[model samples]
Target chain A: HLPNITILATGGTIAGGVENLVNAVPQLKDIANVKGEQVVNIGSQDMNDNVWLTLAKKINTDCDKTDGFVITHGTTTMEETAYFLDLTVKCDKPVVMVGAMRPSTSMSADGPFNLYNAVVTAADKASANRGVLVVMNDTVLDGRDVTTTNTTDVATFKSVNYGPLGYIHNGKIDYQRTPARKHTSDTPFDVSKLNELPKVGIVYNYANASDLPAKALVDAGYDGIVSAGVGNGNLYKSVFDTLATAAKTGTAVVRSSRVPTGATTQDAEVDDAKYGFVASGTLNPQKARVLLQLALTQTKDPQQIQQIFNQY
Target chain B: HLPNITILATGGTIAGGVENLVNAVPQLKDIANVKGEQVVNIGSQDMNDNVWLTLAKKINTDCDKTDGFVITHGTTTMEETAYFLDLTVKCDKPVVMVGAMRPSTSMSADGPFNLYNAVVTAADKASANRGVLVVMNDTVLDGRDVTTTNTTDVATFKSVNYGPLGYIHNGKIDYQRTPARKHTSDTPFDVSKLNELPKVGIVYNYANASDLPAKALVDAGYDGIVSAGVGNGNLYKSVFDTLATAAKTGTAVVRSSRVPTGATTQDAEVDDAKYGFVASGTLNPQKARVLLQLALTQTKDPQQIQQIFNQY
Candidate 1:
């Protein structure tokens, strides 16, 4: 039998409203015995914790039923969901997330090509232990690093701190670097029993920004806050003071940057430990918020949170 | 007169006590009669409108005094200041902004080489009429597009929507594309008479982001607001409703994106005109906020603001 692949279709621009996987690109069947199933039919912006759980459970149970899996999702929050699956799924089978910026009905739509490459990536044995992959615009990115950068461009997804883990061209997947951080089948996370993720809010920093946002989140009883600080993840003094107070009041604070790419160094610009703030090493505010939500679920200890930020 | 290049030093990592311009590279002296002046000596995170006004005034007066100008600044707010100069400096002469990620004292520090290239870019006649250029990592980027991406990496600055306009290699500056938008002397902005820019606030979007931050900014009387929406500048229903209300209340709301690259397209998923909102075409929220601030200074008409977003 051909390499068995189960495609979990969660609505993006690539769902039932347009040409979908397998049917959209019949050539994908040449690579694998493709099976398509619709898990949800909504744009990625509406992706939530419930769908994430359903997808993770399905993938975990289907590890033996299929050789690999592919997810059709919206480019927005695709990385978030991919990273979530990367941490939650306890299997070595390849899982690839694919999306398109332009609708399938549009000329030169990237969905069909991306779907074909995603199947190729999933069916390939080399992709087995590479965590979860995001395939779009001929680039294969690690779930932890890839982001939908452009709003409408076909080449919207990109890896920031690290470039793409590899590229997929002519149905070939070429990896440049293996991520050292532990991923799927190796991560210490399980979300099968979890219904809702802890609340984490993100606040942006700019010149003359107010601390009211941080104060508001704190008052609203959020578990954590990610400060998308200006440069080197440095916050204005006004916001910093309020965040410091929030950190003392049991709200976890993580410092990430609004700058597109870069590691937010711990204690370089701000004394992170002194203020009980965790530095989100290379994570952007969005990803940092994801990790922070998971971290807060385990422990409120600042040192432990900082360590988690470094390791994953 | 050796091209009469003025090196306006604004104490990034490339200030005194470190191996800086001419003395560090020596070849830079061959490119211009470089005169160095310390405009300010502080990290770029501390950059404010006051310094922006001072720099703009100096450049306005020095436009005829020098063949071209080169600024050694911190990479953090370099793009902001460069865009400010790109708009305010009414000169055809080249205005190059250069910065280094690594400290001057560090091994393999990129400052000396970047500084050398900036001088060469300033002296080159081909660099004229390109608004302001950001030179780093052997790449030349248009001021309005380039941003400080990576936090600690040497190769940090990058232009998102469009790639770098050119590159500098082996003492040669090669430009691939010229920005067609109106800039510098061609722009309608006159910062020489302004002491402070209008207040513009940026709010980041997340999975379940609250409208309280947006509400607080509006209530606090911000002149304009940039909703750094999730993907393709799509706002959550909660934020969308809140921003719609803000738009009706006379606050100029522009739907920019938190995503690094790509445009916040107009009238795609959101009916921006119905909400009295402007779309940030290919401009990130930070850059969008910059333009909105300048637009607010001119007029508050949403149509005029939308037109401004389209051009710049």
Candidate 2:
């Protein structure tokens, strides 16, 4: 806790006074910035999108003398924020995200230890410039690949289909995998001042999931849409009609699925091909949203979307 | 097409029918069974557990002279039923489960092709006496290892961290990785009379998720619960408290994760040990549920459950 670390507290479970890990009490508050020693005070998943940007900026601004910065956030949108920060932040200092399964408020709180470790990681010169990281339990992961796989447990962060970049051991950070995408404040997109997050929403399709949302959202002026279709990211008729219609109307529609573990195929479904939508490579719907938002920043051409999907 | 096939259809998008692929008018109910020149159609996802028993019995009673059994179902619970049948069905006949990413009701649905391939695979004399199998999109997987990773895309099914048992190429089933699990009706647990599925649920940890549903379900008479915990299945304090309390009340709790891939650690969280909860290894929550339910049918001791978690 003595490291020259700048703590960017985005209110997550890390900052709230959670009586139980199940009930999220901090819906729209600045629960972040709690001392590292008292991290387990709140549950992280209670964090929403608004808290995400503030925390990102806080870490960049406060921890100037710090070798790196540590962040503790909720697990649900943590991966998205981590990946977004990874792509958007231009800082050379290491930024690590950490959270715990049990809150300090609970009898079995595990947050204190994880937060302590994250502080150590942030202060460590070794963790500097390692890209945005997610450290939980002992594992350190690249934010681009991280996702919340579990609801409870100290080691909730995972890179998904891929392995962790490194692990923390005896107060030291060990590097494993190297990040593929180049990240820095040098990035072109000014995500910090975006008036609105790309109006991206996901639609999951089984056999007959109502397409009411698709028409409604499209009519409501969504920028992009991700369809969490069944196997291979293929949509049902009801869903496909809406998606195709949306694509025709210039919404950058991308196809993904609720299945977290497999890739999508392009030649497998007809409507998917006809609509000129993009296919996510084993990426689930959530990740697709991130990629979709970024891809729309360039062009909405389905082929170009495929190019973005492939490059990322 | 002439295999001793008893197509047991569990409804999914594949079972859904739209008036047409586009426009999607007159979303019809009681849509007549999808037509397949080669394969048979069973029931929908909501079709009772008896529907499965009916298929099994029909295969045994009516198709005694047949070559093999190929069951087609929605991916939602296909893995669940596959694992269940893998444990209960004793017949040496090759029992193949198949599904599609899209439905016949949708335009360019991928179901018909998958259905045809499954029928072809089930008809293969070489498929006989093999463990329960899954034939989808020209791929054949051992039910013992297969799982539906994506909600969409025809190619979303996978056999855990393992590769497909074999691939279907040029209309032929190719064998690859052989499963090592010790299974069959000949095992210690005889599931011939399994009328209802064991009450099993997965409580995944991701920051802070509500516990009322999980607890309420337990109080409502679930036989087993899988805790998708953090770090090796570690639970947050609040949820862990509820889980531990539930376990003390005789509700079985097992740890799993919200992470997409990898193994769950055992003995990571403290109270889990006190509560006598079990930790699932490598297996994802859904797959873990299948294995856990089976384990409970045999015994409910913590050590025994732990042992099953380790080996299975």
Candidate 3:
């Protein structure tokens, strides 16, 4: 029963200003007068922040006859926005998020194809019941599970620690699984009403990493911190000691991993449960930040917080 | 040089106590009691906490005469001990932990062979540089990254959101990757001096699940909670409310996904960071609990705590 669709534009590399095809390579052009498709402006970075919300509202207003909505955002944080939209927007009509790793001026431009897939996915009735979804690189993933694993590869977007919910190939949408928990705007609480934002920072755990960043974040008034630790989530003792001191001062601390895949872990000797530090569940530090921020918008009760972490 | 490997055995189905395979399964006897020349028995769960500690202490003592150590434990909480050893035992020596998916009496007994592999890995020079490790089925994984993924599969231990560091096949040890983080008792801090045990709990999220578990943990005085959310870490509002309450009470909350793979996520509307919760970095909440407990023992600094989450 869906109609035509909607497309929301956000700013970022996917939507940034890429001028010309000839000026695509650094060898051909510089910070100077860039001109062609590469020379012309391809502005796409508009997708980073709250642009999608505004776009979504506008899409419905301009087109009441739409079957669904297709969002084209900058890739930098497109994965993040997709998940957010999936959780907050209650669209009976399919809502698809699409983006690219390359610019329109580039010979291997992915925008056209991605946009095409988005259009097809939005137009299809089978895609309607599926929650917020990402149509990119010929693959379809639940926004909740999709992530930008690579900085700029054409297939950079991936569902980490878990398999793809489905895939879009040969101009078709194939589903592998369904999201198992409560989600979408149907929840009793609407997250959009959340007013406050969390202040959090990521600290890498290289050998002899300065404690300054940890200290600075503590001083900067962040409500919490997600620490990217080593294998099995182990921390450099000195750095941990510094953070431990801050934890005693009443700040929230979280442990995560820097590995591209897997999680931070520990043995019985270390009493993670006794300490008040939280562990990042299968989420990379970056994704952890997003989840943590969203969870904070609800309440600060630790058990409830744990529930949020568990359920989300 | 590491020497005198110590073996700590915790009783489980691998120890031949299971509802199934006791009488009906003919292979049960052979698989349940895997006894070999190198196989050693510590004590059962009835041995008491002091006995377990003594076993761990003996492991450190044995390290003087051996290159590594192996522990044969029941699968249920074998993950807890593996994580514990990864954090507490000081030394680059491989502290390989192993277990079986089925009781010895099952159709295919997988314990003795796995136990044999654990010994070889524990005694190998190649394993010395690695952190705490888990060898089960035929896969070898960093203890920091490994978790029990499947309940019945022999090949169940897996590194959440990550790949195995190595594997054991045909009685040979092979390492595909090495952890960048450092570990072992020789580090600047002495883990043996550790007396405080952090209290971490797991929250399994499901459709319309009650908040009884959250309330019960809080009543039991737990310091942190790692929530296991359904697909892609989506949290139910009922659970979120409970966690928020617990956070206000000074307990750290963490979010994790129940899916075997993929990342949990968040959005502006649902901000966990602001709420003072932690992201369980791809660690199934249970495993994350171990890491969080260990990190807490060292320090509570939010920054340092987060670094633990960030550990690769």
Evaluate all candidate structures by whole-model CA lDDT and list the values in order. 0.82, 0.62, 0.58
Least lDDT summed over 10 consecutive residues: which range in candidate 2 chain A?
A25-34
Best by TM-score: 1
lDDT of 3 at A98: 79
**On a 0 to 1 TM-score scale, where does candidate 1 land against the true structure?**
0.88
DockQ of all candidates, in order?
Answer: 0.49, 0.13, 0.03
- What is candidate 1's CA lDDT for residue B210? 71
Worst 10 residues of 1 chain A by lDDT: A12-21
Better model by lDDT: candidate 1 vs candidate 2: 1
DockQ of 1: 0.49
| Chain B TM-score in each of the candidates | 0.95, 0.80, 0.77
Report the lDDT tens digits of candidate 1 across residue range A193-287. 78788888889887666677777788889899999987799887678888999999899999999987778889998998799999998888888
Runs of candidate 3 exceeding 4 Å displacement: A1-116, A122-137, A140-312, B1-7, B12-55, B64-67, B91-93, B160-162, B186-196, B203-221, B227-284, B307-312
Q: Ranking under DockQ, best-scoring first?
A: 1, 2, 3
lDDT of 3 by residue, A1-312 (tens): 324454454443343233332232332222112221121122332122234344434443444456677665655455556665665565567777877767766787887667666667777778866777887888777776676653335877777666676667765677767676555654433444444456555554432233554665676666666666544445555557766776667566677654445544432213555566666656666566656666666765444555665666
Clash number for model 1?
4
Superposed by TM-score, candidate 2 places the C-alpha of residue B191 at a distance from the truth, in angstroms, of 4.0
